[PDB]
DNA sequence: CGTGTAATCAGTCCGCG
DNA sequence: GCGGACTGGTTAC
């Protein structure tokens, strides 16, 4: 096999890298890599070597890379730009693997951890390490086994082994349910004493060193834990241990507020699987339990124990110890579902970057644009300091708040990185300026055309036809990854609503699933066994289906993610090709498309009903418009047709056969005026929005930008077998409003869109008849809780203090004296509940930390002061008012002059 | 910690005769 | 009470 490299560290004058070579073997070497930097020299010298800008240079080889780096300094010294990657890794992963690497995950250790450890005065201080690590289940990807360490006998208290066999059994028979899957997986090992197991962890970590290492929390909990453990009861040295090449580095992580430690292990890559999921899952969480996540991501019940974690070790060792392995299998689980170190693995193996730099754009981009330049012997610019100045983003159409019955809506394929690919933005295409008119005078084409030699964006700037920049080029390569999986992930969701159909007539019969690719559309072969199958066996496919589109999904949306990074990486100071003029040529071409084609479809529109001066398109965001179709359907009249499904066809024929042609012919039109590279302008159909056929539902409706609801039956070719409800923006959309209160806002909007006026009224009248029987958790807002010290004036709120933040100083308040009720920590999530007047809290809320019920000392105070009123009104009253005010309906029925009888 | 800007909204403080 | 200036926080794209 061709080899690749694991991980890669500079340490001093060698390069560490550990590898798999040619026969699929775990190597270590350590190299003495000589870099080499670049200057830029005379044209009477001849050289290989060029800048972006095709000026000559000179290559200048060093003994080592500390002289590298003096010379680095010294050109600073000097005022002289001195060339290429400075990151020597990097240069040696692109000398190193001149090829396009492939790379087999099986050769690749993946260690997936978790410890437990027993505090009585609060949580216990990754940087302290005070009390002993009593458990670590530590699962090898490689051996595909949990290794379970067991600290018997601590100051703590002594136990008992844990008993596999007890594990095993359901909870109804007093075990602890362990899954089957992984019983036979586990190899646990009791220890009598904390050095032993801490001993013995460390050898079993040399023989099976991780490359990939994750878990939740394990960089700002378990890894700094074990770290500082080892080093207080051991020395410095052993601590060492975990790292391959024995080196360690406290890093101090900075924000906006204060600072936290991280210990990085060189030859090692933490992939801290929150870290990962919040990068790349496109969810805000309430919380960030493993709990919370694992309920919403797998459907599994909260792990169920009596009493406070402090003391679940001498209560209930069995149950103790059974919650850690399970905890690290459902880690395993999420991503074996969402499939992130996947992702990471191949994204950093395509840009040749140490596999955590996935984190960081800018670096991932740095690192591919760098190695497609080296491929023709070009050479990187030096990175400079730049001061941070604002600069103008999307164009975002004002709408008029109403009612819209009929809706078509469109955007453009891969907006901005079409943009660049369309324009030719790139740092060395650059070939001037041009005179700017006002953006109006562009888009109505009254402008002087920009340019007759190169390709333009209406912000002024011109670039060169006659050749691909690096930044298109490499764009587009990573652009066709993602529509390859994007194509996977809208089959998957294709079939799964063949299946949901199917589900609709069930078979009475002993069968099983279908062994299908879910990636392809279903064949009709296929579809025709699945019209005989039974309700399980189908069932069982649609899960299938669903576990394909999420498996798409992933990697379709976080390619996505990358190339859009880059349009941003070109407006952050931090990156080699920071310029202005690029990111700003950008986001002005994007507002000139959308205005542009705004006033083209309200043009053909216009043209095909007989009118003039109707405003077709009444909202637009970026690069997307939205068209009133009540006019479309109204020239073939609503009683032609024969179901819902029937004018959804029309749409769809419609915005397929007479929109896409004249949205094509208007981009074409305006990429001639700007005299572009080419034509990438793709605006495909994304929704047809509408009542159902017959009833008295409003379809959709816009309070204002951002803000708006649509009742969808056919999304990006995926014809829906109930209709889907497209919301943005609106209180159900966001992590900060409690949970029953989204669920409720939600069936209220689904009611006014599909079935009208009444039955909005007949739904709002029972949720205020009940809602004071919801759990409270369910009713609680959420928000971060930062900056909780500043307005902390001697445990009463300062000035200006924000409502959840009095909140969280009421809570500190309520549990002064207690070492043991669960503190809110500064950054994280906090659950928000307001207090009726003269409750013993003395205030008018109480927060206390997300994901979590509230300590038993002040649960039953917080139920019985609940100001359910305020609740109600701030939550669902007011958001709900907003809807029906915007919508022009009435949530409470008006008096008429029926009543009189 | 980790690429960008536009936008609404909750809440505090205080004006507004 | 409603708005503006302002702080905080969260979403659309
Ligand atoms: N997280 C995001 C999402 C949007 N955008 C910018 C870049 C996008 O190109 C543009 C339009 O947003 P879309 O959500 O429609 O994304 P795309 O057009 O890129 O992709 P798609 O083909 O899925 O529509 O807005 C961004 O900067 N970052
Ligand atoms: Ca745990
Ligand atoms: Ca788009
Ligand atoms: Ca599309
Ligand atoms: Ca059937
Ligand atoms: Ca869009």
Same mark, same amino acid.
């Given at each position: ?7 890669? =560290? ?22 003495? *890599? ?11 010298? %001849? ?5 972006? *800008? ?218 801290? *699987? ?66 992130? #170190? ?24 740095? %690192? ?31 709408? #008029? ?16 990185? &079409? ?30 055309? +920009? &340019? ?113 990074? $880059?349009?941003?990486? $070109? ?8 310029? $202005? ?26 043209? !095909? ?106 999304? =990006? ?23 029953? !209160?989204?669920?409720?806002?939600? =069936? ?32 609680? &807002?959420?928000? &971060? ?16 203090? +924000? ?36 409750? +013993? ?61």
């Amino acid at each position: 096999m061709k080899e690749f490299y694991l991980t890669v =560290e500079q340490i001093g004058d060698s390069i560490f890298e550990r590898y798999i070579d040619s026969n699929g073997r775990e190597r270590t070497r350590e190299v003495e *890599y000589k870099p080499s930097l670049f200057a830029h020299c005379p044209e009477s010298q %001849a050289t290989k070597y060029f800048d972006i *800008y095709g000026k000559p240079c000179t290559r200048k080889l060093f003994a080592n890379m500390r002289d590298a780096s003096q010379w680095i300094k010294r050109m600073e010294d000097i005022g002289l730009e001195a060339l290429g990657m400075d990151d020597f890794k990097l240069a040696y992963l692109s000398d190193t693997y001149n090829y396009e690497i492939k790379y087999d995950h099986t050769k690749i250790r993946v260690a997936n951890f978790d410890i437990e450890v027993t505090s009585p005065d609060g949580f216990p201080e990754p940087s302290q390490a005070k009390h002993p690590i009593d458990a670590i289940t530590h699962y090898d990807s490689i051996d595909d086994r949990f290794y379970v360490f067991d600290l018997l006998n601590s100051p703590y208290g002594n136990v008992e082994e844990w008993s596999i066999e007890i594990a095993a059994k359901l909870q109804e028979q007093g075990g602890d349910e362990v899954p089957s899957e992984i019983i036979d997986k586990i190899i646990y090992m009791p220890f009598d004493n904390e050095k032993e197991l801490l001993m013995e962890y460390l050898n079993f970590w040399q023989q099976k060193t991780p490359v990939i290492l994750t878990g939740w929390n394990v960089e700002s909990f378990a890894i700094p834990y074990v770290y500082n453990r080892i080093k207080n009861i051991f020395g410095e040295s052993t601590a060492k241990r975990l790292s391959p090449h024995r080196k360690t580095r406290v890093k101090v992580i900075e924000n906006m507020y204060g600072s936290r430690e991280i210990i990085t292990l060189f030859g090692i890559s933490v992939l801290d *699987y929150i870290d990962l999921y919040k990068k790349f899952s496109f969810t805000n969480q309430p919380s960030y339990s493993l709990d919370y996540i694992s309920e919403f991501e797998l459907n599994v019940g909260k792990l169920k124990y009596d009493g406070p974690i402090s003391k679940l070790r001498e209560s209930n060792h069995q149950r103790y110890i059974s919650y850690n392995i399970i905890a690290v299998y459902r880690v395993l689980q999420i991503d074996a579902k969402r499939q992130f #170190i996947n992702l990471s693995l191949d994204m950093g193996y395509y840009a040749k970057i140490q596999i955590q730099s996935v984190f960081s754009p800018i670096k991932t981009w740095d %690192a591919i644009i760098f190695n497609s330049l080296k491929e023709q012997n070009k050479v990187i610019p030096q990175g400079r300091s730049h001061p941070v100045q604002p600069y103008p983003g999307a164009f975002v159409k004002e709408p #008029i708040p109403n009612r819209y019955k009929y809706v078509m809506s469109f955007d453009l394929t891969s907006a901005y990185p &079409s943009i660049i690919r369309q324009v030719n933005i790139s740092p060395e295409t650059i070939a001037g300026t041009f005179k700017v008119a006002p953006l109006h005078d562009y888009i109505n084409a009254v402008a002087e055309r +920009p &340019s007759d030699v190169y390709s333009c964006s209406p912000n002024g700037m011109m670039y060169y036809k006659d050749r691909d920049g690096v930044v298109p080029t490499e764009i587009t390569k990573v652009f066709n990854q993602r529509k390859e999986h994007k194509g996977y992930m809208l089959a998957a969701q294709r079939n799964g609503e063949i299946i949901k159909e199917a589900l609709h007539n069930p078979n009475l019969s002993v069968d099983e699933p279908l062994d299908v690719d879910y990636r392809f559309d279903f064949s009709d072969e296929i579809k025709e066994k699945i019209k005989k199958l039974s309700a399980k066996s189908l069932n069982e496919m649609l899960f299938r289906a669903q576990r394909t589109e999420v498996a798409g999904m992933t990697a379709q949306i976080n390619r996505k993610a990358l190339i859009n990074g $880059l349009a941003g990486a $070109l407006g952050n100071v931090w990156f080699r090709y920071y310029d $202005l003029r690029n990111a700003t040529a950008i986001t002005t071409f994007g507002q000139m498309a959308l205005q542009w084609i705004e006033r083209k479809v309200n043009e053909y529109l216009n043209e !095909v009903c007989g009118t003039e001066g109707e405003a077709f398109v009444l909202y637009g965001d970026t690069d997307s418009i939205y068209v009133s179709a009540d006019k479309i359907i109204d020239k073939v009249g609503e009683s032609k047709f024969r179901d819902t499904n029937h004018w959804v066809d029309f749409l769809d024929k419609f915005a397929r056969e007479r929109m896409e042609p004249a949205i094509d012919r208007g981009f074409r039109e305006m990429c001639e005026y700007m005299n572009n590279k080419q034509h990438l302008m793709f605006m495909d159909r994304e929704a047809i929005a509408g009542p159902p056929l017959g009833s008295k539902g409003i379809g959709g409706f816009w309070t204002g930008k951002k803000r708006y609801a649509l009742n969808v039956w056919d999304m =990006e070719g995926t014809r829906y077998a109930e209709p889907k409800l497209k919301i943005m923006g609106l209180e159900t959309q966001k992590s900060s409003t409690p949970k029953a !209160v989204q669920k409720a806002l939600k =069936e209220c909007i689904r009611r006014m869109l599909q079935e009208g006026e009444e039955s909005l009224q007949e739904y709002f009248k029972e949720f205020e008849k009940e809602f004071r029987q919801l759990n409270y958790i369910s009713i609680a &807002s959420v928000s &971060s809780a930062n900056n909780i010290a500043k307005y902390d004036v001697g445990g009463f709120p300062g000035p200006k203090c +924000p409502f959840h933040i009095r909140g969280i100083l009421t809570y500190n308040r309520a549990i002064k004296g207690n070492i043991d009720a669960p503190q809110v920590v500064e950054g994280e999530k906090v659950y928000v509940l307001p207090l009726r007047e003269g409750n +013993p809290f003395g205030d008018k809320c109480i927060a206390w930390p997300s994901g979590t019920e509230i300590t038993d000392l002040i649960k039953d105070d917080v139920l019985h002061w609940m100001d359910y009123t305020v609740l109600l009104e701030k939550t669902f009253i007011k958001p709900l008012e907003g809807f029906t005010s915007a919508a022009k309906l009435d949530y409470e029925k008006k008096a008429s002059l029926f009543d009189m009888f």
